[PDB]
Design the sequence.
RNA sequence: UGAACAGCCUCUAGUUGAUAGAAUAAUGUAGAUAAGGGAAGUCGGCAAAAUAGAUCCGUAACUUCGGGAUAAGGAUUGGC
RNA sequence: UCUUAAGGUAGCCAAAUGCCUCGUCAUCUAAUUAGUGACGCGCAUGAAUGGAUUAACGAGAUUCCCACUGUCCCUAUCUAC
RNA sequence: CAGUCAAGCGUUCAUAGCGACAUUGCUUUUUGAUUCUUCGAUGUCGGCUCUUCCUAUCAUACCGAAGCAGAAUUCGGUAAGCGUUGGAUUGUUCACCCACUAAUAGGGAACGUGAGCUGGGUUUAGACCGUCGUGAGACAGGUUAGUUUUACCCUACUGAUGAAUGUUACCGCAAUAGUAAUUGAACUUAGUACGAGAGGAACAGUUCAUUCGGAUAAUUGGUUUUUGCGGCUGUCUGAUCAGGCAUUGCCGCGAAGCUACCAUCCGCUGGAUUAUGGCUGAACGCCUCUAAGUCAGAAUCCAUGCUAGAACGCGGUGAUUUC
């Protein structure tokens, strides 16, 4: 969340601590994302910053074109793979972690989205919602 | 509200019960409990498990509804 | 030297000592401020915690993402059979604190209430209030005089009432007796109310109302002797720690040459008296009514009791209070329900709540059905059936 | 059983010896399992986990030409 | 140009041998006093005081990668004594 | 680390902010000087865990001043209540980077803390190299391997019983001790105030979120000796059924209990003040928040509330024994 955060999101269970690697869901040519920080996270002794669905993270690419390696960039998580409770009462989860590359304002670097996205993330970033195929 | 139908066992799912699973191909599978979900994770065929509604319908058990 | 990295405390220093409570019934240490304008009514009630359940209600909050959209919440159900008003006591204020000066009891007491006065009821003459009963049988000699004494003094009047334990599924057979302050007006009217209510019952719907913002007072679940790690939530020592790791490494510096009172240490956990505030009532149930769990949208004749009965408790044949959230204390424990101390608007304490559906599925496991009629409809006939 | 005086069960033979009873608090010693992440812990992957038999396929750099090599990496295994 | 008996040749190096030093450059990482590859006026490398390599071997020392996991985020539960 | 004077800097202008030449001070988180105590031994670095305290305040609260139009920023006051992180390299303290954050402030407690841990370093004995020494050997030169002992005693702390107060039981009071909540974002205000434009807020309200705390198990997840059901291997009971053994034989599911920001709920409002800004009004016929008097005001203090209930504090009430 942060600059591009249009609206507020209810709390959802954290499933992506720093050091986690997730798949790239866009067509920018990255294969995976390496988490190094989470925007808007608090501070505590020995508590690893953790990411959730729809949170903006500071991420790094380990596999992809060399133009994307060796440099940090913002990212937005689109699939969690850890069950979280929506306020309608349902627990839901995808089968894998996934994110996309975006600028600090939330404009996605890529142009298309592969696979479904979480409704919590789509409702919060309009640009991600625009390029998303299936939203749940 | 609307009461869900289990994707595996067909059992009725009331609000706040069970777990919902979205597969990478965007298809959604709702499991009423941990048992059905775990069996699904083992690639078990619902038609081979003796207590699922699909098995009972395919084996004509308690099928006195349609004449 | 100084602490290398700053970190918050573990636990709360304002909730000491973490010793066992004095009695199994928590005592209300403060009552709502008295306004001598409204009619005379109770400020609290006594009930028993039966269990928790799941509720479906349409949230109504302008601005939120789930505004006018459906949400699922968890609530606890408290059995509240009507209490019996037996005796009132007056309190006169003194420069050393409030003091009770006199107590006036009812002429007749039930069997279950006086069992509180005996540690061995089965071998006893059961001579409780027998000569006090002889204080009656003349018009008002010894009783009306004490009532007038209360009227002339005793700015604060409290009423002694006891639960009807015989109506609950519990097998305790011993009533719980407690005091409730009356917050009406004109203390003479207070004692008139009390005397008129001797040997009479009071139903919970006469005290609490739907959507009312109430409070819970009960003793929490005990857990016996407990290690420091779970008692206070401290960090566990690394794996290769000699002489145990579920501890605290340093319990104090060299000076002062004493163990500080603020250092987490092993001791009994739970069974403490706690006052939990701001818990909204959702339904005021009546035991003299089937379809207790039926809402304006469910419309199925089913009581609040799940299939097979509430776990470890039983049924809810009596009136019940079902409040949002969780209240301290486990099932089968006496709990005291209290009015809120202050007026809270908050635009959430003024929220109107109308339920949709009540989870009456069996809590003894992954319950699938809500009614044996529904179970029979779904499963069809079986070998047990004919 | 199995490649096998491996591990497991049994036959002949020999023991049933090691202070006991009652409960199941904390911390322990020994044994384990843990959702999501996967060394971010730590001086240091310490400890633990993962692989494992046999059959078939496939097997690099380098080399003293002998090795490397079970390299790596795959597939199969029951009962009738 | 002074001087030794001769004045470090072949080789090799911030190496287990380099104070300055966390040397400079490149790579490795988001970030590296680590590692590796180079440079060498090298306090104070160097030739059976053996120099340089070296397949194979190592309960030898160090770095990274894949799989793996309660090492950790962040703790929880179970059994025996 | 902080003052005093003020030649100058600052478009003018000592003091918005700095400030030379001088001079007065404070601290003991540096390093020195000394050797007062300890050599019939007080277990030395560092890291980990944990509590409390100091303020010379990094942020949060409220204000004052500016070379404060706004935004941003700087100086200062009351202020220690609350918080001050995750990592790469190094044994490091220290340092440097990456990144988040409102912020990544400085220190003490025998340079806190080894019968709390670890042993990476230093700092025994083995060994290698370089320089030095003829040699044994030396090197705050480098490298590698190298046993971390005892608490049952007293006190302290945490919990736990308990005689005597005619007996016993029930309901209470509250002296005293403790105390807690914290911070951010988004929308709206508003592209408004302000500004030539560039840019560009705040007050009130709403939805949430960070850190912390107390509970609880309706749901989800974990846990399996329910050895509850089923399956599978080897062997034994002639075969079948059903079973024993393999230190719980192994695998799947698995109720109950316990449990998780891996789950849900909840976390109050009054007064008095600090800094500061004001009123009337002298001193001082004028003037002034001050002298007498007095108004408002901070995350401050005391209260409301919450926790224990003096085991030598107290009250009300029931019953109070017959060879
Ligand atoms: Mg740490
Ligand atoms: Mg379960
Ligand atoms: Mg320390
Ligand atoms: Mg500090
Ligand atoms: Mg807890
Ligand atoms: Mg050890
Ligand atoms: Mg249950
Ligand atoms: Mg054979
Ligand atoms: Mg054998
Ligand atoms: Mg013995
Ligand atoms: Mg670290
Ligand atoms: Mg030599
Ligand atoms: Mg000395
Ligand atoms: Mg000495
Ligand atoms: Mg001595
Ligand atoms: Mg000592
Ligand atoms: Mg100060
Ligand atoms: Mg000192
Ligand atoms: Mg010590
Ligand atoms: Mg040595
Ligand atoms: Mg030697
Ligand atoms: Mg020599
Ligand atoms: Mg020396
Ligand atoms: Mg007090
Ligand atoms: Mg469980
Ligand atoms: Mg004036």
Sequence:
């Amino acid at each position: 969340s942060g600059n591009g955060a249009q609206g507020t999101k209810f709390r959802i269970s954290l499933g992506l601590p720093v050091g986690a690697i997730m798949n790239c869901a866009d067509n920018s040519g990255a294969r995976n994302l390496y988490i190094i920080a989470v925007k808007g996270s608090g501070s505590r002794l020995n508590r690893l910053p953790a990411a959730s669905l729809g949170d903006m993270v500071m991420a790094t690419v380990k596999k992809g074109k060399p133009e994307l390696r060796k440099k940090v960039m913002p990212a937005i998580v689109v699939r969690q793979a850890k069950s979280w409770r929506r306020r309608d009462g349902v627990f839901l989860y995808f089968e894998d972690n996934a994110g996309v590359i975006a600028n600090p304002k939330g404009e996605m670097k890529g142009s298309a989205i592969t696979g479904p996205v979480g409704k919590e993330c789509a409702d919060l970033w309009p640009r991600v919602a625009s390029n998303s195929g299936v939203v749940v | 509200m609307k009461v869900e139908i289990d994707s595996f066992s067909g059992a009725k799912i009331y609000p706040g019960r069970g777990t919902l699973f979205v597969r990478g191909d965007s298809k959604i599978f709702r499991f009423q409990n941990s048992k059905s979900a775990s069996l699904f994770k083992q690639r078990k065929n619902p038609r081979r498990i003796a207590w699922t509604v699909l098995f009972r319908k395919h084996h004509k058990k308690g099928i006195t509804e349609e004449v | 030297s100084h602490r290398k990295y700053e970190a918050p405390r573990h636990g709360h220093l304002g909730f000491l000592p973490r010793k066992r409570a004095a009695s199994i019934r928590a005592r209300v240490k403060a009552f709502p401020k008295d306004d001598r304008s409204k009619p005379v009514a109770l400020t609290s009630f006594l009930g028993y915690k039966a269990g928790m359940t799941t509720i479906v209600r349409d949230l109504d909050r302008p601005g939120s993402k789930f505004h006018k959209r459906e949400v699922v919440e968890a609530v606890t159900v408290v059995d509240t059979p009507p209490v019996v008003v037996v005796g009132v006591v007056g309190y006169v204020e003194t420069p050393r604190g409030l003091r009770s000066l006199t107590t006036v009891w009812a002429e007749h007491l039930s069997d279950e209430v006086k069992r509180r006065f005996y540690k061995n009821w089965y071998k006893s003459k059961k001579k409780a209030f027998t000569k006090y009963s002889a204080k009656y049988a003349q018009d008002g000699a010894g009783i009306e005089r004490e009532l007038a004494r209360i009227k002339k003094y005793a700015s604060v009047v409290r009423v002694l009432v006891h639960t009807q334990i015989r109506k609950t599924p519990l097998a305790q057979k011993k009533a719980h007796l407690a005091e409730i302050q009356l917050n009406g007006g004109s203390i003479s009217e207070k004692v008139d109310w009390a005397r008129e209510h001797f040997e009479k019952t009071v139903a919970v719907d006469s005290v609490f109302e739907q959507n009312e913002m109430i409070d819970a007072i009960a003793v929490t679940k005990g857990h016996g002797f407990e290690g420091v790690t779970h008692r206070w939530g401290t960090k566990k020592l690394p794996r290769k720690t000699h002489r145990g790791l579920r501890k605290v490494a340093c319990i104090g510096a060299w000076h002062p040459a004493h163990v500080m009172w603020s250092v987490a240490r092993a001791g009994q956990r739970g069974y403490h008296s706690r006052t939990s505030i701001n818990h909204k009532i959702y339904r005021v149930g009546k035991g003299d009514d089937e379809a207790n769990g039926a809402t304006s949208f469910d419309r199925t004749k089913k009581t609040i009791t799940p299939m097979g009965g509430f776990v470890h408790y039983g049924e809810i044949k009596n009136d019940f209070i079902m409040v949002k959230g969780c209240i301290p204390g486990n099932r089968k424990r006496i709990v005291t329900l209290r009015k809120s101390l202050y007026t809270n608007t908050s635009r959430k304490a003024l929220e109107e709540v109308s339920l949709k559906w009540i989870d009456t599925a069996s809590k003894f496991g992954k319950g699938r059905f809500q009614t044996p009629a529904e179970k029979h409809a779904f499963m069809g006939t079986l070998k047990k059936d004919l």
Residues 1-2, 5-11, 13-15, 18-19, 36-49, 58, 72, 82-85, 89, 91 of chain A lie near RNA strand F (CB under 10 Å from a C1').
